[PDB]
């Protein structure tokens, strides 16, 4: 199971950015984590196999929305009204058992990481 | 295809199911688990519905051991249970799973695989998580479709390793109709028309999404099957074959079963009728949704049981008549949906909640249902591969709560231990599985052998009234007897025609001459006569009018009149006639004296005296010269217990025989007095304030007269009764024997409901032999009616089988059985078709069959 | 069929009925 992030880069604050994780069989839970230099990885958002269950971190509830298209094996993270507090490396994760969990030891496969930078 | 079902409305000798047929039993999570708020189970709509609209259950969730014990006792191959969604996912959305509930289902699945029991797992059996009703509107909101597919996905992932049979929803018809139409079921919205059809729509669409999920992602590595359980009722037309009653029948079926079946098992759409009748209440499938509904079931799971039948608002009957005929229902599925493979996913009935373990009717309902399934498989070629009895154990039965029971296993809910006791149907379903059908065990295999060269082969007729070859009557009879290889003929005289006075002072001598002519013509055919003096029938009591109006058989002088009549007939026929029956079935003559219980006993006392006076007259004054033999015929149907696991029903079967045969047989054959069993039983129910009837003791003179007054034992045997112990009220004869009867509607039977139960005659002969010893026995009546007027296959069948058991009683059991008289020779037009010849004197096929047996002296090798 | 009774098909009788012999 390989995952690939797309759509990082630099954004003006209050702007918007959209990451996608493409995967290469079975159903899975799509996850997203962000990590800043010297801090522990923090959960951002996750989504059940057919999208009935979406979970978000409080710090992003309202601004971020997660969605997926199973036909293309892609989960999307739609980030709107980005803060400087949102600058981090963003990792997509996959978990096989269709249970939406918020801690990183619960995800089996991890993407390489994409950088998101919010400047003024 | 759609509509092909209406066709449905416009000798079966199979006992055992296909090899590899598949036997199971079911439960549903909410009925049996208990522990509704335990180990972080979320509440369901049914938890809320009970604590709002009503007032531990089987406690399976803590007693898994005890239900695995019951499964092992039954011997089922599969067990069908359901996963309580809120016990896994308290808020239905698939956030963190509740690990103690996952442990329970995992532990159950492990145990079944290790006991070699296939799990059939049902995702949704009505217990929707309360949080989805409150947040979304439950099945009203179509967001449920993915909430449901997520839940199934986890369930496939956690259990598909071990589960090869999956049901998405149990009976979506009730989900929509009673949840939102009637308000009988959670969540309890009444009259919400738009909801009913939106709910149905979301259930259909959710199922389909789960099927495709399973088809794509799990079937390749798990290789199981998925269906949905469609419940329905059955219906038959109000009027015989009314063309538009039949159309309403079809509408009723479509409205319940077609509504969900046509999208899933049919063309992919709702039924055309519904689409018209509901052009804008009913949602619309896009042409692409139509192609993704068609075919989302790997078999027809079908439910047929009390929940599609009661209460009356469950289905629209549309003026036509309700029906429990499972065979026709299965046939309807075969024509509508083009002969799919059917699993019966739920079947059974219910018993009242004060019945504990002796569920007699439950056995016969199960027998009847199973019989209809076997007919469906064998006669109609319906691909029924499995049967789910319902249910494993008593539980909470939805809106009825604990007012009905449906388990094969009793649960006393007031005991903490909640033990699972096998009911009678658990014993019965156990043997069903052991034998893979109907107990082929009371049916011993054919014997080869022959009756002795001097056996009497008879035919019987009833009363003949008088009109030698002059008499037209006798010609037509001779023409019949000439076509039979019988050696004996048994016919009755009309007492009132011989002595219209009832006194010898006025003998009709022409009547005796006609009777004599009957005997003498028969001797020319080489046929001996057994003459019955008095043969009472429903239509004609048979008494000369003066003694009828003088109280009939309640008048002790009616016994003396009979002695006068006997002597006359012995005098005027006894040189020709060497066999005599005084009275035909006097034991069943009690019913004419229906009134007092002491009335029927008194009439029977005078009937015994009549016989003993007639017989002693013969023994003293006519046997020396005539060297003939004299007895009487007792009606002697066999009796077995209705419920064979009730020691009380065994005792009722012996009490029946006491009251039926020993009533007359004990005084006249053995002891000169009534059988002890009868006098002593009638003692209790009168010493216990229930009956004002006494069975009068008999004078030592009365004893002396009746004792030993029979030359042989004569039995009219037709059928076997299945008897129940039931303490009845009243003081009538019927009341004192404390017996009710159960018709096993599933046995090969005649038009008039005579059961073909051959081995009953063998049991009877041995019961007779053991109570009354090695005296000689003639079967003086044996037959069955039959609609067929040329090819009476049922008569042929009865005759071959019963005579085979009589042979067994002769060759194997060594019963001194000397003769067999078949019943009967001809039939009258209004009367049941019991004859070997039609009313027009045309011969039926059984004659050739009876002759062949006679020619062979049995069934030689 | 009395759909509300536990013996909807009325199998439990209590009436023996006449023998073949009494129906002629």
Task: For residue B157, give the chain A residue with the closest CA.
Answer: A97
Is residue A97 within 8 angstroms of chain B, CB to CB?
A: yes
Same domain, B366 and B317: yes
Task: For residue A55, give the chain B residue with the closest CA.
Answer: B95
Longest pairwise C-alpha distance within chain B = 105
Cα angle: B137, vertex B138, B144; to 5 degrees? 115
Domain of residue B25, residue span: 1-441
Last residue of a domain, one of B384, B408, B441: B441
Q: In the 8-state DSSP scheme, what is residue B24?
A: E
Same domain, B412 and B514: no
Chain-centroid distance, C-alpha B806: 25
Strand B409-411 to B420-422 pairing? antiparallel
Assign B385 to helix, strand or coil. Answer: strand
Q: How many domains are contained in chain A?
A: 1
Name chain C contacts of B537, Cβ cutoff 8 Å. Answer: 21-24
Give the closest residue to A56 by CA, choosing from A72, A40, A32, A80.
A32
Chain-centroid distance, C-alpha B124: 35
The sign of the dihedral angle between the CA atoms of B220, B294, B164, B37 is: positive
What's the CA gap between B634 and B589, in Å, rounded?
Answer: 10
Give the closest residue to B171 by CA, choosing from B80, B236, B106.
B80
Strand B713-716 to B629-635 pairing? parallel
Give the closest residue to A31 by CA, choosing from A90, A78, A94.
A94
Mutate one of B742, B751, B802, B826 to test the C interface: name it (highest C CB count within 10 A): B742
Strand A74-79 to B300-304 pairing? unpaired
Helix or strand run (H / E) with residue B293: helix B287-293
Structure tokens at B148: 């449901």
What's the CA gap between C6 and B358, in Å, rounded?
Answer: 13
Is residue A115 within 8 angstroms of chain B, CB to CB?
A: no
What's the CA gap between B762 and B757, in Å, rounded?
Answer: 10
Same domain, B386 and B456: no
The sign of the dihedral angle between the CA atoms of A84, A89, A93, A99 is: negative
Cα angle: B727, vertex B733, B734; to 5 degrees? 45
Is residue A69 within 8 angstroms of chain B, CB to CB?
A: no
Is residue B828 within 8 angstroms of chain C, CB to CB?
A: yes
Residue A97 is nearest to which of B143, B154, B217, comparing CB atoms?
Answer: B154
What's the CA gap between B792 and B272, in Å, rounded?
Answer: 46
Name chain B contacts of A101, Cβ cutoff 8 Å. Answer: 95-96
Q: How many domains are contained in chain B?
A: 2
CA distances from B742 to B58, B757, B816 (A): 31, 14, 32
Instruction: Give how far C13 is from chain B: nearest CA, Å.
Output: 5
CB–CB of B735/B728 below 8 Å? yes
CA distances from B468 to B464, B473, B477, B728 (A): 16, 10, 13, 55
Instruction: Give how far A30 is from chain B: nearest CA, Å.
Output: 13
Q: Percent helix, strand and coil across chain C, each rounded to 5?
A: 0, 5, 95
Main-chain phi, psi angles of B481, to 5 degrees: -60, -30
Main-chain phi, psi angles of B512, to 5 degrees: -60, -40
Contact B149 A97 (CB under 8 A): no
CB–CB of B805/B819 below 8 Å? no
Give the closest residue to A97 by CA, choosing from A30, A36, A24, A45.
A30
What's the CA gap between B474 and B478, in Å, rounded?
Answer: 6
Contacts of C5 (CB under 8 A, 6+ apart): none
Assign B93 to helix, strand or coil. Answer: coil
Assign B297 to helix, strand or coil. Answer: coil
Across-strand partners of A119?
A12
Assign B782 to helix, strand or coil. Answer: coil
Is residue B349 within 8 angstroms of chain C, CB to CB?
A: yes
CA distances from A39 to A34, B122, B692 (A): 10, 46, 99
Contact B95 A97 (CB under 8 A): no
Assign B389 to helix, strand or coil. Answer: strand
Question: Position of tokens 């409080």?
Answer: A58
Instruction: Give how far A119 is from chain B: nearest CA, Å.
Output: 35
Beta carbons within 10 angstroms of residue B687's beta carbon:
9
Residue A50 is nearest to which of B97, B149, B158, comparing CB atoms?
Answer: B149
Chain-centroid distance, C-alpha B584: 30
Is residue B322 within 8 angstroms of chain C, CB to CB?
A: yes
Instruction: Give how far A22 is from chain B: nearest CA, Å.
Output: 19
Contact A48 B93 (CB under 8 A): yes
State yes or no: chains B and A have 3 or more CB pairs below 8 A.
Answer: yes
Question: Position of tokens 């029948």?
Answer: B249
CB–CB of A38/A55 below 8 Å? no
Instruction: Give how far C2 is from chain B: nearest CA, Å.
Output: 9
CB–CB of B261/B336 below 8 Å? yes
CB–CB of B302/B230 below 8 Å? yes
Same domain, B436 and B449: no
Task: For residue B136, give the chain A residue with the closest CA.
Answer: A52
CB pairs under 8 A between A and B: 54
Same domain, B364 and B450: no
Contacts of B269 (CB under 8 A, 6+ apart): B262, B263, B275, B285, B290, B293
Last residue of a domain, one of B388, B414, B441: B441
Structure tokens at B221: 């590595």
Structure tokens at B151: 């839940």
Longest pairwise C-alpha distance within chain C = 38
Contacts of B291 (CB under 8 A, 6+ apart): B268
Beta carbons within 10 angstroms of residue B405's beta carbon:
26
Task: For residue B210, give the chain A residue with the closest CA.
Answer: A50
Question: Position of tokens 């930078």?
Answer: A117
Give the closest residue to B667 by CA, choosing from B586, B763, B761, B746.
B586
Residue B93 is nearest to which of A25, A26, A53, comparing CB atoms?
Answer: A53
User: Crossing angle of helices B326-336/B360-378, nearest 10°?
Assistant: 30
What's the CA gap between A43 and A58, in Å, rounded?
Answer: 10
Same domain, B736 and B820: yes
Across-strand partners of B777?
B713, B817
Same domain, B189 and B237: yes
Ordered alpha helix ranges (H), B470-622: 472-481, 495-498, 509-524, 545-549, 557-573, 597-617
CB–CB of C17/B635 below 8 Å? no
Structure tokens at A117: 């930078």
What's the CA gap between B847 and B788, in Å, rounded?
Answer: 13
Contacts of A116 (CB under 8 A, 6+ apart): A8, A9, A11, A17, A19, A34, A79, A82, A86, A87, A88, A89, A90
Contacts of B324 (CB under 8 A, 6+ apart): B234, B309, C1, C8, C9
CA distances from B703 to B371, B553, B706, B812 (A): 51, 19, 6, 36
Contact B93 A52 (CB under 8 A): yes
Strand B404-405 to B351-352 pairing? antiparallel
User: Crossing angle of helices B64-74/B99-114, nearest 10°?
Assistant: 20
What's the start-to-end Cα distance of chain A, in Å? 37
CB–CB of B466/B514 below 8 Å? yes
What's the CA gap between B553 and B90, in Å, rounded?
Answer: 79
Burial class (CB in 10 A: 0-12, 13-18, 19+), B845: middle
Q: In the 8-state DSSP scheme, what is residue B360?
A: H
Ordered alpha helix ranges (H), B3-55: 29-32, 45-53
Assign B502 to helix, strand or coil. Answer: coil
Last residue of a domain, one of B441, B474, B490: B441
Structure tokens at B279: 């052009």
Burial class (CB in 10 A: 0-12, 13-18, 19+), B508: middle
**Contact residues of B toward A, CB < 8 A:** 93-97, 143, 146-150, 153-154, 157-158, 209, 213, 217
Main-chain phi, psi angles of B798, to 5 degrees: -50, -45
Same domain, B437 and B447: no
Give the closest residue to B122 by CA, choosing from B62, B78, B178.
B78
What's the CA gap between B814 and B810, in Å, rounded?
Answer: 5
Chains that touch B (3 or more CB pairs under 8 A): A, C
Contact B368 C9 (CB under 8 A): yes
Domain of residue A114, residue span: 1-120
CB pairs under 8 A between B and C: 96
User: Crossing angle of helices B144-159/B99-114, nearest 10°?
Assistant: 50
**CATH number of the domain bearing residue B516:** 3.20.20.80
Contacts of B233 (CB under 8 A, 6+ apart): B252, B256, B304, B308, B309, B314, B315, B322, B323
Interfacial B residues in 12-51 facing C (CB < 8 Å): none
Rg (CA), chain A: 13
Cα angle: B700, vertex B635, B770; to 5 degrees? 65
What's the CA gap between B86 and B35, in Å, rounded?
Answer: 12
Question: Position of tokens 């009876």?
Answer: B850
Residue A52 is nearest to which of B146, B213, B217, comparing CB atoms?
Answer: B146
Same domain, B411 and B540: no
Q: How many CA atoms lie within 13 A of A52 on its CB side?
A: 27
Instruction: Give how far B93 is from chain A: nearest CA, Å.
Output: 6
Give the closest residue to B842 by CA, choosing from B467, B476, B486, B490.
B476
Residue C14 is nearest to which of B462, B740, B832, comparing CB atoms?
Answer: B740
Cis peptide before B824 (omega within 30 of 0): yes
Q: What is the DSSP string of B416-435?
A: SS--EEE-HHHHHHHHHHHH
Q: In the 8-state DSSP scheme, what is residue B670?
A: I
What's the start-to-end Cα distance of chain B, in Å? 52
Helix or strand run (H / E) with residue B410: strand B409-411
Same domain, B21 and B131: yes
Cis peptide before B28 (omega within 30 of 0): no
Same domain, B404 and B450: no
What's the start-to-end Cα distance of chain C, in Å? 31
CB–CB of B746/B368 below 8 Å? yes
The b-or-e profile of B8-43 (16+ CB within 10 A means b, else e) is bbeeeeeeebeeebbbbbbbbbbbbbbbbeeeebbb
Assign B463 to helix, strand or coil. Answer: strand
Give the closest residue to B257 by CA, choosing from B188, B205, B319, B315.
B315
Across-strand partners of C20?
none
Question: Position of tokens 């196999």?
Answer: A49
Q: Percent helix, strand and coil across chain A, each rounded to 5?
A: 10, 50, 40
Helix or strand run (H / E) with residue B750: none
Contact B153 A98 (CB under 8 A): yes
Question: Position of tokens 């709107």?
Answer: A80
Contact B209 A49 (CB under 8 A): no
Across-strand partners of A56?
A45
Name chain B contacts of A26, Cβ cutoff 8 Å. Answer: 217
Contacts of B329 (CB under 8 A, 6+ apart): B232, B234, B302, B304
Same domain, B371 and B486: no
Give the closest residue to B805 by CA, choosing from B794, B793, B813.
B813
Burial class (CB in 10 A: 0-12, 13-18, 19+), B857: middle
Beta carbons within 10 angstroms of residue B221's beta carbon:
10
């Amino acid at each position: 199971v390989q995952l690939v992030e797309s759509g990082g880069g630099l954004v003006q604050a209050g702007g918007s950015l959209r990451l996608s994780c493409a995967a290469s069989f079975s159903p899975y839970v799509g996850g997203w984590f962000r990590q800043a230099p010297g801090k522990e990885r923090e959960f951002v958002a996750a989504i059940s196999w057919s999208g009935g269950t979406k979970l978000y971190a409080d710090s992003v509830k309202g601004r971020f929305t997660i969605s997926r298209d199973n036909a293309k094996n892609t989960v999307y993270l739609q980030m709107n009204t980005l803060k400087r507090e949102d600058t981090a490396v963003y990792y997509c994760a996959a978990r096989r058992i269709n249970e939406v969990l918020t801690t990183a030891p619960d995800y089996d496969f991890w993407g390489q990481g994409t950088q998101v930078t919010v400047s003024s | 295809f759609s509509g092909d079902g209406r066709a449905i409305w416009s000798l079966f000798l199979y006992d055992t199911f296909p090899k590899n047929f598949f036997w199971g039993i079911g439960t549903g999570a909410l009925q049996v688990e208990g522990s509704w708020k335990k180990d972080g189970k979320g509440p369901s709509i049914w938890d809320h519905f009970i604590h709002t609209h009503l007032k531990g259950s089987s406690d399976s969730y803590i007693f898994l051991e005890k239900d695995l014990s019951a499964l092992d006792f039954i011997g089922v191959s599969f067990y069908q249970f359901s996963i309580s969604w809120p016990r896994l996912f308290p808020d239905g959305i698939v956030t963190v799973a509740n690990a103690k509930g996952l442990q329970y289902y995992s532990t159950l699945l492990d145990a079944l695989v290790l006991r070699n029991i296939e799990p059939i797992v049902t995702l949704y059996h009505w217990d929707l998580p309360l949080a989805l009703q409150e947040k979304y509107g439950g099945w009203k909101n179509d967001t449920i479709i993915d909430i449901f597919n997520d839940y199934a996905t986890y369930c496939f992932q956690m259990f598909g390793d071990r589960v090869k049979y999956w049901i998405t929803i149990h009976n979506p018809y009730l989900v929509a109709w009673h949840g939102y139409g009637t308000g009988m079921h959670a969540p309890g919205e009444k009259g919400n028309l738009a909801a009913v059809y939106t709910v149905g729509h979301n259930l259909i669409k959710a199922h389909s999404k789960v099927w495709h999920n399973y088809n794509t992602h799990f079937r390749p590595h798990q290789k199981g099957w998925l269906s949905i359980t469609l419940g329905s009722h059955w219906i038959e037309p109000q009027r015989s074959e009314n063309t538009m009653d039949i159309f309403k029948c079809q509408q009723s079926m479509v409205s319940v079963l077609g509504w969900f079946a046509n999208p899933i098992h049919g063309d992919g759409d709702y039924p055309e009728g519904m689409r018209k009748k509901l052009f804008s209440v009913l949602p619309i499938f896009s042409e692409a949704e139509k192609h993704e509904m068609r075919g989302t079931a790997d078999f027809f799971a079908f439910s047929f049981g009390p929940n599609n039948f009661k209460p009356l608002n469950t289905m629209a009957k549309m003026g036509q008549n309700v029906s429990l005929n499972l065979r026709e229902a299965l046939n309807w599925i075969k024509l509508e949906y083009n002969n799919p493979r059917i699993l019966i996913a739920e079947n059974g009935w219910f018993t009242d909640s004060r019945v504990k373990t002796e569920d007699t009717t439950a056995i016969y309902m199960m027998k009847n249902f199973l019989s209809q399934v076997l007919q469906a498989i064998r006669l109609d070629e319906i691909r029924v591969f499995g049967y789910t009895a319902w249910s494993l154990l008593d539980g909470f039965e939805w809106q009825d709560a604990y007012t009905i029971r449906r388990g094969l296993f009793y649960v006393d809910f007031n005991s903490k231990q909640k033990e699972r006791k096998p009911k009678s149907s658990a014993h019965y379903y156990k043997q069903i599985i052991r034998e893979n059908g109907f107990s082929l065990k009371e049916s011993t295999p054919d014997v080869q052998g022959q009756f002795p060269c001097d056996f009497s082969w008879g035919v019987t007729e009833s009363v003949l009234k008088p009109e030698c070859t002059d008499f037209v009557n006798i010609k037509k009879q001779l023409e019949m007897l000439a076509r039979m290889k019988v050696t004996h003929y048994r016919f009755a005289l009309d007492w009132a025609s011989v002595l219209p006075t009832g006194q010898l002072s006025a003998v009709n001598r022409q009547a005796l001459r006609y009777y004599r002519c009957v005997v003498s013509e028969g001797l020319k055919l080489g046929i001996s006569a057994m003459v019955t003096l008095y043969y009472p029938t429903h239509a004609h009591l048979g008494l000369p009018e003066p003694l009828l109006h003088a109280d009939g058989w309640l008048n002790p002088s009616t016994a003396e009149a009979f002695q006068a009549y006997a002597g006359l007939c012995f005098q005027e026929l006894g040189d020709l006639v060497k066999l005599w029956i005084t009275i035909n079935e006097p034991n069943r003559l009690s019913d004419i004296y229906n009134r007092s219980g002491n009335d029927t006993y008194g009439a029977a006392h005078n009937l015994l005296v009549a016989h003993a006076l007639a017989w002693r007259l013969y023994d003293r004054q006519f046997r020396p010269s005539q060297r003939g033999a004299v007895s009487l015929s007792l009606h002697a149907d066999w009796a077995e217990p209705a419920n064979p696991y009730a020691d009380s029903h065994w005792r009722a079967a012996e009490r029946f025989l006491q009251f039926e045969i020993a009533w007359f047989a004990e005084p006249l054959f053995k002891t000169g007095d009534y059988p002890a069993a009868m006098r002593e039983y009638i003692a209790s129910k009168h010493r216990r304030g229930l009956s004002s009837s006494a069975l009068p003791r008999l004078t030592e003179a009365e004893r002396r007269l009746l004792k030993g007054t029979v030359d042989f034992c004569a039995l009219n045997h037709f059928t076997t009764r299945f008897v129940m112990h039931e303490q009845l009220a009243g003081s009538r004869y019927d009341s004192d024997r404390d017996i009710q009867f159960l018709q096993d509607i599933t046995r090969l039977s005649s038009p008039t409901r005579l059961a073909v139960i051959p081995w009953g005659v063998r049991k009877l002969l041995r019961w007779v032999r053991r109570n009354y010893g090695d005296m000689d026995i003639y079967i003086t009546a044996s037959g069955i009616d039959d609609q067929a007027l040329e090819d009476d296959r049922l008569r042929k069948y009865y005759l071959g089988k019963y005579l085979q058991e009589v042979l067994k009683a002769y060759l194997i059991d060594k019963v001194r059985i000397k003769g067999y008289y078949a019943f009967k020779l001809a039939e009258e037009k209004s009367k049941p078709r019991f004859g070997f010849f039609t009313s027009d004197f045309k011969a039926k096929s059984s004659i050739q069959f009876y002759n062949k047996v006679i020619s062979s002296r049995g069934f030689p090798f | 069929p009395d759909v509300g009774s536990s013996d909807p098909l009325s199998m439990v009788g209590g009436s023996q009925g006449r023998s073949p012999s009494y129906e002629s």
